[PDB]
Write a protein that binds this ligand. Structure first.
Ligand code: ADP
Ligand code: MG
Ligand code: ZN
Length: 628
RNA sequence: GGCGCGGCUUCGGCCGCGCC
């Protein structure tokens, strides 16, 4: 929409000269505009009586929509036809002819992947230009790389057939698991080879101009020491062991109700354990599961508390708990809750003692405080964003600030104007000169007690430098030499790809059995299992329908050719294991099951085999026929 | 349901972000 910056002009040059190029430029510097310039040029270069055809790949839906609107709006004067296909722009719309009848097409990559496989789009020769957004994803088995495997099979396999020009956009080509500066460079050449790029476009002549429009904060690291003696954790942990023991009383097999393993009190993974346990027990069986929901609620609160105590001050954790229980005994208040609240009360005074103890303060907070003093002394006109781990840590930090004499110059608020200069939050849901990551996940401070976090961070910094040095070096090579290297890397990768064919599994045609992984009851047999479109597995017969119950899906999805309309579970007395889903498929109401919800058992022997994915299950897979 | 990519892994997986 607005007038091109000089670096944008510079970045679009190699592409406009027809070269396959990767445009590597910082986020928000305007690569999409560069792609608009390249696209405009590409379509305009064709003499009257010919046409180009441009395809643009967005890896995600929001990007897809944004660029559909942007490319549509930009190309109105030109009169070019602009449409796009997403997983929703389906399915009774003939894709081949949508490509025939358009000039610019925005695709999610999987769509091209599918139609290429199904033969409905015979060749990428239908395109004259392919633009890959987030092009650093063009590796391994990713959709981008499937598309490029098709390209390269056409280029190398000698089936010509003109090929389209290929350009990619990224903010970072990356280096992978490179340890030295030569492994990094080799990875980069591998990326170029995947995309058939012979040119990497970086800003070289307008650096000092690009610099002015880019958020590149000064990155700082302060490792902070965790609390020396912590007796708050010990007490709360004992409460959690207690209530877990209570929850096991109404649910014997509690330790096996969740897939999540080796939970630790006061961690995020414990929270995740909570969530999976609660979605496994849905509110006669409602009584057991409701009680279970109570226990796991209190366990959730305790987990929260531990985390608060870890990163804020024990007073904050204990306040949080006190308020929670004040809520419980003011909107409850049946036996289990009275019992739980009492068990808390029996420890309340010791917790109370341990909290107000000077030895039990958090030095981490002193560190953060210090950073705030210094920075607001160097510039009191400073706007800060303070990232914390949990919702509760937001409030803990806010109270801590409002009640800290040394920070009486900060007017805080959570997610302006006469007084809000620091905002505490969890996710970003740019105008802030000071960014602080206080135990999370222009200046930027990372504060953590975890040396591993810092280690990884310094590793990523070093990687960035290896990447930049490597690109710089690459760009000095004559294009011919580089194309020759690219050629032979591509030849090599192609050989590996074709040599490492499957081969077809050859099935064990013997009848095996299928039981609910949880309660081991008879679900069905393998001879009763049909495959729908290569990848989906259903079961035949009414005898199977007595073994599952249906229950409306939280989020109905319209995927491929199916219509997910229900979640399905075991029918037993309070198993209710997640078996899979129920779909409307074409005209049929059928169940679709996942192999991870079943134990396979050999009928003759009794041994039990376990399978994560149907890909790994090698049985006489009978193709599904409707009239049965 | 299935696929892809990441982070951990007791290599049994677990989790996260996406896509069809
Ligand atoms: N030359 C320019 N002058 C002013 N604003 C621009 C210019 N180029 C891009 N912008 C704006 O800045 C934003 C950059 O976004 P985008 O180009 O998609 O960034 P990225 O290339 O990192 O994805 C765009 O939304 C655009 O509206
Ligand atoms: Mg972009
Ligand atoms: Zn069951």
């Amino acid at each position: 929409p607005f007038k091109p910056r000089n670096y944008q002009l510079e970045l679009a040059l190699p592409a406009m000269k027809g070269k396959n190029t990767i445009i590597c430029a910082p986020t928000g510097c305007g690569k999409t505009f560069v792609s608009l310039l390249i696209c405009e040029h590409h379509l305009k270069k064709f003499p009257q009586g010919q046409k180009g055809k441009v395809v643009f790949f967005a890896n995600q839906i929001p990007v897809y929509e944004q660029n559909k609107s942007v490319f549509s709006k930009y190309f109105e004067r030109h009169g070019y036809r602009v449409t796009g296909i997403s997983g929703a722009t389906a399915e009774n719309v003939p894709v081949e002819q949508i490509v025939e009848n358009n000039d610019i097409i925005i695709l999610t990559p999987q769509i091209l992947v599918n139609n290429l496989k199904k033969g409905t789009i015979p060749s990428l020769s239908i395109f004259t230009l392919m633009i890959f957004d987030e092009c650093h994803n063009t590796s391994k088995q990713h959709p981008y790389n499937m598309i490029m495997f098709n390209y390269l099979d056409q280029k190398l396999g000698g089936s010509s057939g003109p090929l389209p020009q290929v350009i990619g956009l990224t903010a970072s080509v990356g280096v992978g698991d490179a340890k030295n500066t030569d492994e990094a460079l080799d990875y980069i050449c591998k990326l170029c080879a995947s995309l058939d790029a012979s040119v990497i476009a970086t800003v070289k002549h307008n650096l000092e101009e690009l610099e002015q429009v880019v958020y590149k904060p000064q990155k700082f690291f302060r490792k902070v020491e965790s609390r020396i003696s912590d007796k708050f954790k010990y007490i709360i942990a004992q409460l959690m062991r207690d209530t877990e023991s209570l929850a096991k009383r109404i649910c014997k097999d509690l330790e096996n109700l969740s897939q999540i393993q080796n939970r630790e009190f006061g961690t995020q993974k414990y929270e995740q354990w909570i969530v999976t346990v609660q979605k496994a027990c849905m509110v006669e069986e409602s009584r057991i599961c409701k009680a279970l929901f109570l226990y796991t609620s209190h366990l959730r609160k305790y987990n929260d508390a531990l985390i608060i105590s870890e990163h804020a001050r024990m007073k904050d954790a204990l306040d949080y708990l006190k308020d929670f229980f004040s809520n419980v005994r003011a909107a409850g208040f049946d036996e289990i809750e009275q019992d739980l609240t009492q068990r808390f009360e029996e420890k309340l005074q010791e917790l109370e003692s341990v909290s107000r103890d000077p030895s039990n303060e958090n030095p981490k907070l002193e560190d953060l405080c210090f950073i705030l003093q210094e920075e607001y002394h160097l510039n009191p006109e400073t706007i800060t964003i303070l990232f914390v781990k949990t919702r509760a840590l937001v409030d803990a930090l806010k109270n801590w600030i409002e009640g800290n004499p040394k920070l009486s110059f900060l007017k805080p608020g959570i997610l302006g104007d006469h007084n809000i200069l620091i905002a505490t939050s969890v996710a970003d849901e740019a105008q802030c000169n000071l960014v602080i990551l206080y135990e999370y996940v222009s200046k930027c401070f990372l504060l953590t007690s975890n040396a591993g976090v810092i280690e990884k961070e310094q590793i990523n910094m070093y990687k960035e430098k290896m990447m930049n040095d490597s690109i710089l070096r690459l760009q000095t090579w004559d294009e011919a030499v580089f194309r020759e290297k690219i050629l032979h890397i591509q030849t090599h990768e192609k050989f590996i790809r074709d040599s490492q064919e499957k081969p077809k599994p050859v099935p064990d045609k013997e009848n095996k059995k299928l039981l609910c992984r949880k309660c081991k009851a008879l679900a069905c047999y393998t001879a009763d299992v049909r495959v729908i479109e290569d990848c989906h597995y259903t079961v035949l017969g009414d005898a199977f329908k007595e073994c599952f119950v249906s229950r409306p899906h939280p989020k109905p999805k319209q995927f491929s050719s199916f219509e997910k309309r229900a979640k399905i579970f075991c029918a037993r007395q309070n198993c209710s294991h997640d078996w899979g889903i129920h779909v409307k498929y074409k005209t049929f109401e059928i169940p679709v099951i996942k192999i991870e919800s079943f134990v396979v058992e050999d009928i003759a022997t009794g041994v039990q085999t376990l399978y994560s994915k149907w890909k790994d299950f090698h049985f006489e897979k009978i193709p599904f026929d409707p009239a049965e």
